[PDB]
Amino acid sequence: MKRLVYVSKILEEIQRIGKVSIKNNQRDNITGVLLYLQGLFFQILEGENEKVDKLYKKILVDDRHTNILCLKTEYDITDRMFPNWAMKTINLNENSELMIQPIKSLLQTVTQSHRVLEKYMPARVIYLINQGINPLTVEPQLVEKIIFFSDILAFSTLTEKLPVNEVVILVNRYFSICTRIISAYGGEVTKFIGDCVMASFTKEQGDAAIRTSLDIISELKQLRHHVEATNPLHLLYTGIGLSYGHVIEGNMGSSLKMDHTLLGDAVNVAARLEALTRQLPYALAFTAGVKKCCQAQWTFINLGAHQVEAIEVYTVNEAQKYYDTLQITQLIRQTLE
Amino acid sequence: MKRLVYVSKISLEEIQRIGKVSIKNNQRDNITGVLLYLQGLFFQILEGENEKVDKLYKKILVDDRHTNILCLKTEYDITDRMFPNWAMKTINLNENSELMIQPIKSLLQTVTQSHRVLEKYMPARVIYLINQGINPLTVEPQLVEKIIFFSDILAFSTLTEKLPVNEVVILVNRYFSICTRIISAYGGEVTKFIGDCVMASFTKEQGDAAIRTSLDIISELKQLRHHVEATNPLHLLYTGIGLSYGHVIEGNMGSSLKMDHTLLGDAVNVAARLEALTRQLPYALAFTAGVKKCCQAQWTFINLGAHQVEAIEVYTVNEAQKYYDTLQITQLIRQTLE
Numbered sequence: 265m266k267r268l269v270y271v272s273k274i275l276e277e278i279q280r281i282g283k284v285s286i287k288n289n290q291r292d293n294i295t296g297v298l299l300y301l302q303g304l305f306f307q308i309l310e311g312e313n314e315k316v317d318k319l320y321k322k323i324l325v326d327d328r329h330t331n332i333l334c335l336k337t338e339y340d341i342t343d344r345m346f347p348n349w350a351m352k353t354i355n356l357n358e359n360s361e362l363m364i365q366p367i368k369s370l371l372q373t374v375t376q377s378h379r380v381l382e383k384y385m386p387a388r389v390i391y392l393i394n395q396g397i398n399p400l401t402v403e404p405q406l407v408e409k410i411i412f413f414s415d416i417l418a419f420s421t422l423t424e425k426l427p428v429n430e431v432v433i434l435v436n437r438y439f440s441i442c443t444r445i446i447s448a449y450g451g452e453v454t455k456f457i458g459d460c461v462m463a464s465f466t467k468e469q470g471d472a473a474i475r476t477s478l479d480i481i482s483e484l485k486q487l488r489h490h491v492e493a494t495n496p497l498h499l500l501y502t503g504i505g506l507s508y509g510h511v512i513e514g515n516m517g518s519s520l521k522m523d524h525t526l527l528g529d530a531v532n533v534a535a536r537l538e539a540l541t542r543q544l545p546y547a548l549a550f551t552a553g554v555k556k557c558c559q560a561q562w563t564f565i566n567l568g569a570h571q572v573e574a575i576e577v578y579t580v581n582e583a584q585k586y587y588d589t590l591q592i593t594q595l596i597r598q599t600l601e
Numbered sequence: 602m603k604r605l606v607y608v609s610k611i612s613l614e615e616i617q618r619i620g621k622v623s624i625k626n627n628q629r630d631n632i633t634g635v636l637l638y639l640q641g642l643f644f645q646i647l648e649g650e651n652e653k654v655d656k657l658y659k660k661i662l663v664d665d666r667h668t669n670i671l672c673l674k675t676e677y678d679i680t681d682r683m684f685p686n687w688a689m690k691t692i693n694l695n696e697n698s699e700l701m702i703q704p705i706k707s708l709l710q711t712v713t714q715s716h717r718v719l720e721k722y723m724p725a726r727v728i729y730l731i732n733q734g735i736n737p738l739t740v741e742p743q744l745v746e747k748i749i750f751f752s753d754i755l756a757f758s759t760l761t762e763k764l765p766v767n768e769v770v771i772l773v774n775r776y777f778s779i780c781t782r783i784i785s786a787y788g789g790e791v792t793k794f795i796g797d798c799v800m801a802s803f804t805k806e807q808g809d810a811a812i813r814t815s816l817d818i819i820s821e822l823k824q825l826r827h828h829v830e831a832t833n834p835l836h837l838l839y840t841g842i843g844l845s846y847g848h849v850i851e852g853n854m855g856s857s858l859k860m861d862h863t864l865l866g867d868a869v870n871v872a873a874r875l876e877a878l879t880r881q882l883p884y885a886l887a888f889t890a891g892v893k894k895c896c897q898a899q900w901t902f903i904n905l906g907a908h909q910v911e912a913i914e915v916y917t918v919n920e921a922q923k924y925y926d927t928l929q930i931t932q933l934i935r936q937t938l939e
């Protein structure tokens with residue numbers, strides 16, 4: 265016996281939604297409550313985990329509501345909380361009971377506020393919250409991750425020369441492209457550090473980490489020729505570093521400020537392979553360890569030993585640079601002056 | 602007139618005296634509102650003419666029986682009042698046995714409980730903004746002059762290699778706890794943690810603050826080391842600190858998918874590098890000419906010559922001298938860990 269609680273973003277159709285959920289939840293044996301307030305849903309679903317989930321999956325696929333977040337989960341509950349309500353839909357906008365108006369006010373406010381904060385949250389925290397887990401309570405673990413670093417090439421020159429607002433548009437589009445792909449491929453972005461994107465994949469995701477990289481590179485290449493030469497995006501290039509090692513993962517800091525962080529040498533090895541791509545005919549570089557997390561039959565190029573005790577460095581064929589790198593930063597420089 | 606809304610964490614019978622005196626001090630100041638108590642948390646709405654409910658809001662910020670106050674919403678120049686008949690209506694939901702409101706009491710308690718956890722992950726700047734009533738996601742980034750602060754643990758990769766996981770965590774949490782406390786005490790903002798590094802910034806008028814922050818960090822780690830026993834890893838906790846001063850863009854960046862608050866500019870790289878430099882120097886603080894120009898206090902500045910990172914003149918203050926040498930600390934750190 266389990267129970268989840270989620271919030272999402274969305275009159276007669278609502279009634280239809282409700283009638284159908286009572287009959288199926290009556291069949292499935294799970295009971296719950298559903299609340300609607302000013303474009304916001306809340307829903308609790310409790311029972312045998314079997315189709316708590318399967319019901320949930322159907323809810324996720326449905327097109328009406330959107331931006332679904334599972335706020336909490338609970339396993340092994342001695343009791344149910346709503347034992348006789350297959351689904352009790354509560355439209356709260358027309359409940360104008362006086363001593364209830366204050367609570368609707370607070371619920372709306374903290375919720376909308378909540379949904380803003382959700383945008384700043386590291387994706388591993390948001391994940392933990394789905395699984396019903398207090399990220400403040402999880403003990404950090406030591407895990408073998410693939411670590412991903414990428415930044416924008418010659419970013420000090422674009423900053424030196426573009427107006428501030430062009431610089432934002434450029435970074436924003438870089439982070440947008442980087443996040444979507446990394447996320448699509450199973451990865452998790454840890455944070456932005458300046459222009460740099462940091463992320464990590466599991467050890468079963470070697471192939472996805474290379475594909476991710478290759479997709480970033482490729483998407484920025486397409487953007488460069490889709491825009492006009494007056495567009496700064498025309499100048500956006502990246503380099504990508506990947507390492508593989510053990511890292512303490514988890515939530516750290518104090519009650520005053522927390523962060524989700526990875527600690528370990530491999531983080532720094534990845535940063536410096538990223539920085540090394542500036543001197544190489546490839547925009548992606550990575551270690552023997554990443555090489556071993558891969559199942560696809562890549563064509564691996566030994567780039568040689570680089571110190572950072574020395575570490576052998578590898579890339580794949582598909583990452584060859586069709587350009588000369590330090591020529592580009594001379595390109596960027598001329599262009600912007 | 603105005604309307605504001607906040608949560609706080611508490612720090613039965615005196616709950617309702619807060620009721621009593623607000624219910625009595627408020628209306629004479631001509632304000633209305635509601636006070637909700639739920640599981641150690643307070644939510645309040647306070648509505649009146651603008652100058653009066655500000656003076657009340659501040660007498661409340663410093664009121665000693667709650668803490669972790671966040672003002673969520675701030676409405677200006679309201680047309681009417683939400684609770685015109687309530688000088689201040691107190692409501693304690695813990696004791697609303699009625700199951701009928703229990704679904705919405707259960708969803709209010711879940712959400713805010715979540716909210717207060719997400720708060721602890723936010724950039725301090727966006728918590729600042731929410732308290733000022735500005736929506737953080739619609740502030741356009743500005744190019745501003747800041748002092749950039751970086752600090753990190755000395756020989757941390759040797760710690761990570763010889764301590765067990767839980768001990769490293771204890772060590773890192775304590776170091777962040779201290780850093781964040783003092784940076785925030787002095788008016789800086791932590792911008793993020795990166796591995797073991799603390800990254801913060803101060804305004805141009807906070808140069809002495811940025812130095813004193815740095816010396817206070819260093820001083821606290823020094824007391825901790827001798828306060829604890831030799832089997833306690835905190836006994837081996839050291840830091841180095843780098844300060845730069847430069848133009849940086851400070852704004853919300855990312856995509857609807859992920860957003861961050863951050864700073865772009867060379868000053869960031871300059872300060873991280875200066876910090877990496879302190880390992881090579883007799884001093885645990887290092888900073889640039891520009892930082893130094895932001896200081897008004899009469900410090901004894903010490904010039905450590907130029908350093909390529911074009912070259913950078915580097916300064917410290919005498920108070921920052923290490924009573925140790927820095928390569929032994931590395932080998933001492935290593936030997937102690939059997």
Ligand SMILES: Cc1cc2nc3c(=O)[nH]c(=O)nc-3n(C[C@H](O)[C@H](O)[C@H](O)COP(=O)(O)O)c2cc1C
Nearest residue numbers: 619622623626627643645657660661664666667689
């Ligand atoms: C959660 C909470 C809400 C409060 N709300 C009010 C309020 O609405 N109005 C008010 O005058 N005081 C409020 N107070 C605190 C009192 O004003 C405080 O005791 C104050 O020192 C009394 O004012 P006085 O010293 O001028 O007599 C609140 C305190 C708490 C903890």
